[PDB]
Design a protein around this nucleic acid. Structure first.
Ligand SMILES: [Zn+2]
Lengths: 193, 122, 84, 70, 62, 50
RNA sequence: GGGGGACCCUGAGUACCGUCGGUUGGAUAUCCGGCGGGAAGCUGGGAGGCAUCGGCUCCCAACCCUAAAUACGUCCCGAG
RNA sequence: GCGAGGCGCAGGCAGCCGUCGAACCGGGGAUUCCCGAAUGGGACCUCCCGCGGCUUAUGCCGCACUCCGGGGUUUAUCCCCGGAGGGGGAACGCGGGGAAUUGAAACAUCUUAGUACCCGCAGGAAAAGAAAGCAAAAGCGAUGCCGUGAGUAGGGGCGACCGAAAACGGCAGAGGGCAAACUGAACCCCGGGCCGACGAGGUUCGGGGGAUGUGGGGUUGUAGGGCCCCCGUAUGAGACC
């Protein structure tokens, strides 16, 4: 099918036409807002695998974020040498998770279903976020996705229940080494991460 | 302006002839509508002609059709209007590709389209 | 009719005003406007109003002086209300 | 007044009675502020509660008429 | 084991049918019946459990 | 003070009405148990909260 | 509902490697993140406390949901 | 429902309500000023000023921002229909940011501490949850909680100190759906109609989606599933609305 061909093309963009296409697309994207809804997903196979469907209630949002870690604000009170670092620090949430949260902030009435990497230059990184409308009858009538309509699935991205959130919390490991990651980070004194 | 996956320029007369061939094949033959079905038909080596749309975005959907058709020795032609291609195919939604498996009563038309494509760039 | 008028004012100053200047003194509801007071008086008492003045007392209640036209007597309305 | 007898009369009569009760309530409040021979200190309370009953039953009649018509 | 539907309320307050055996939620009774008959039907001699581990557990229980 | 917003005037009016003695008949009814309430105020000594 | 196949499918900037910061009992062998690289993909792939080779054992990630056993007491019965 | 009194804390004067069943109690309704997420626009004062339809007029109904699914055109995010988010909640929950006094008899690795506190996000619970796991004479078989393993393995100016899991015994027990192989509009939602019972279900019309794939199937490890071939089965037996 076409999905395998798209996956093969996007395997390594620099080793196919996707490299030049991505360069031109990045040139176009650098001039667009940080968060922008798009008509169709760029990587159809990835969107479908993550749960996108061609029906009312689904939204694809491109989000641009800056690469690198973070610089801590200057400390005002006295500090011991172990706590004075500012420069060499990194966020504990992945940039994909951060972009998902930005998309969630932009769209308040939807829920973040998933996200995937779609390109990056030496300065920025681009993600495409699949989001769902829990109040649409078409979404409700679909047993595959209707579970988002329940009350306890509000702010799932913010609480860390997406794929990126699970990866950040370490829920992709089992057995040895995953002793402090379940049932939650807080439940283990917040020291498993 | 022209997407990278287009490998040559087709005249309006040839594009309209391809659309008419698609319509006649739908009426009195066998056609496959949609990129997935067209790719499957090409891989199985049953389609006698492939028609693509020039306004497919993103182009990853049809970026493999020309190389695949060249590998399998299948003529492929371009048409400007995706919506008109879908309408000719007979569905109520735009179609990004079409394949003709049984020419039906458009055998001469498809043969001439293939010859002209060979002359242009094959 | 209506909720504009709460109660007539039966004070000595009010009585003097009725006797002299053809004026009736009412305690009305706060949100009422001068047109509302005029219309309420005219409809309830079948009299013609010449002028309306309003104030808000230090107790938070609105007091209205309604000066009737010379064609109608305020003493008659006071008697009808039992002001005496 | 009793809810049964209020329900007996029509909406227009209810409005007229409400107007009369409001005027009488104003009159009695003025009389209370003026004099001291309060023969019946409960007249104000009775008039106010009768006004409430009249308005409530008028609203009930309006709602039931609308429901029946629809 | 009984598989009667359990009613749940969404954010808008509409109604759902929750399967008591796995927790899946439906809005259409046809889909609810189809799931109850296709997923857990092996409990009544119609089909077999899925997964080597689950099959071993069920055989041990039996 | 000369120019007052209506809401502030109404609040002052409410405080003025609040400030008054306990009724003698209330004292009799309570049998000399209720004599004073916390909201009594002297304008020169106890100022309003606003 | 069962048997056979030689055909097709099974999640990618992902697993993983190097370095830096945080975190951890995790000690050359915890987990998360940044930067620079980066596959196989069923004739396949992963784990078994330094690395690699062979044997053996156990598994199929990179998508999703899940009641009961639990935590709390604004509040309600009961008791000391 | 109770059955002769009642009008709060609150023992007074006067009067009134109740046997056409009050007071009181449980359920359901009506009214419910202003500010307040406060929302048509403003707040040095919880008060003011606005724009359109209906209405004779009284007087009602609409107009915040950020979006979702539609329509119109003027293409202006300008107008119209439907629908969301906003704020709160004592403790509990989830995800991030993150000190010092203090101890080490000073102090920098460390400890205090992933603590105080800060930002964001839910519910009556939340999170976790069904193995690329745990263990090797045997083997077990989702998650969560307790006892214990245990101040042990192990970390540590190896200083002060920090510090688990597996196994075992218990509580409670439950497991399912996708992406793809294949099929190709057989599909979903809104409004109306008809048959059915007013429901379930069946059928039909218009609109919006859908070939960039709606629906059918399929969910797994010395393997599982599609497709092909052969044998038989379904007559019967479930389950659910
Ligand atoms: Zn189920």
């Amino acid at each position: 099918g076409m999905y395998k061909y798209i996956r093969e093309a996007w395997k390594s963009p620099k080793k196919s036409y996707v490299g030049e296409l991505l360069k031109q697309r990045m040139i176009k994207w650098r001039r667009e807002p940080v968060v922008v809804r798009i008509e169709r997903p760029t990587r159809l196979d990835r969107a479908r695998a993550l749960g996108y469907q061609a029906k009312q209630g689904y939204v694809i949002v491109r989000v641009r974020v800056r690469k690198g870690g973070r610089k801590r604000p200057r400390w005002k009170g006295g500090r011991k040498p172990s706590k004075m670092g500012q420069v060499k620090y990194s966020p504990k949430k992945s940039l994909q998770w951060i972009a998902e949260e930005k998309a969630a902030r932009k769209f308040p009435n939807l829920e973040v279903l998933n996200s995937y990497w779609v390109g990056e230059d030496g300065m920025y990184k681009w993600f495409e976020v699949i989001m769902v409308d829990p109040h649409h009858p078409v979404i409700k009538s679909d047993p595959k996705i209707a579970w988002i309509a329940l009350k306890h699935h509000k702010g799932r991205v913010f609480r860390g229940l997406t794929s990126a959130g699970k990866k950040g919390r370490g829920l992709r490991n089992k057995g040895k080494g995953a002793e402090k990651v379940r049932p939650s980070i807080r439940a283990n004194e917040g020291k498993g991460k | 302006a022209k997407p990278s996956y287009v490998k040559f320029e087709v005249p309006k007369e040839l594009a309209e002839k391809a659309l008419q061939a698609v319509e006649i094949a739908r009426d009195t033959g066998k056609i496959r509508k949609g990129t997935n079905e067209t790719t499957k038909a090409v891989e199985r080596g049953q389609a006698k002609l492939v028609i693509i749309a020039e306004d497919v975005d993103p182009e990853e959907i049809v970026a493999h059709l020309p190389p695949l058709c060249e590998e399998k020795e299948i003529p492929y032609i371009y048409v400007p209007s995706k919506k008109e291609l879908g309408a000719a195919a007979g569905i109520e939604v735009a179609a990004a590709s079409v394949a003709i498996i049984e020419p039906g009563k458009a055998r001469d038309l498809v043969e001439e389209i293939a010859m002209k494509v060979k002359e242009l760039m094959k | 009719p209506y909720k504009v008028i709460i109660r007539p004012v039966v004070t000595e100053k009010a009585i003097s005003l009725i006797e002299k200047e053809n004026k009736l003194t009412f305690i009305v509801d706060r949100r009422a406007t001068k047109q509302d007071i005029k219309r309420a008086v005219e409809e309830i008492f079948n009299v013609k109003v010449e002028k309306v003045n309003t104030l808000i007392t230090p107790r938070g209640e609105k007091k209205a002086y309604v000066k009737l036209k010379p064609e109608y007597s305020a003493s008659e309305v006071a008697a009808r209300l039992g002001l005496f | 007044m009793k809810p049964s007898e209020i329900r007996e009369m029509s909406i227009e009569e209810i409005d007229a009675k409400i107007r009369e009760l409001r005027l009488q309530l104003a009159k009695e409040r003025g009389l209370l502020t003026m004099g001291t021979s309060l023969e019946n200190p409960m007249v104000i309370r009775n008039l106010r509660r009768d006004i409430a009953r009249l308005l409530t039953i008028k609203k009930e009649k309006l709602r039931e008429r609308e429901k029946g018509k629809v | 084991v009984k598989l009667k539907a359990i009613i749940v309320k969404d954010r808008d307050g509409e109604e759902f049918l929750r399967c008591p055996r796995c927790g899946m939620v439906f809005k259409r009774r046809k889909d609810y019946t189809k799931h109850v008959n296709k997923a857990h039907g092996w409990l009544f001699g119609r089909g077999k459990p899925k997964g080597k581990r689950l099959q071993k557990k069920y055989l041990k229980a039996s | 003070a000369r120019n007052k917003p209506l809401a502030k005037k109404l609040r002052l009016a409410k405080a003025l009405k609040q400030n008054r003695r306990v009724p003698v008949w209330v004292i009799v009814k309570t049998n000399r148990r209720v004599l004073t309430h916390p909201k009594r105020r002297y304008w020169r000594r106890t100022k309003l909260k606003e």
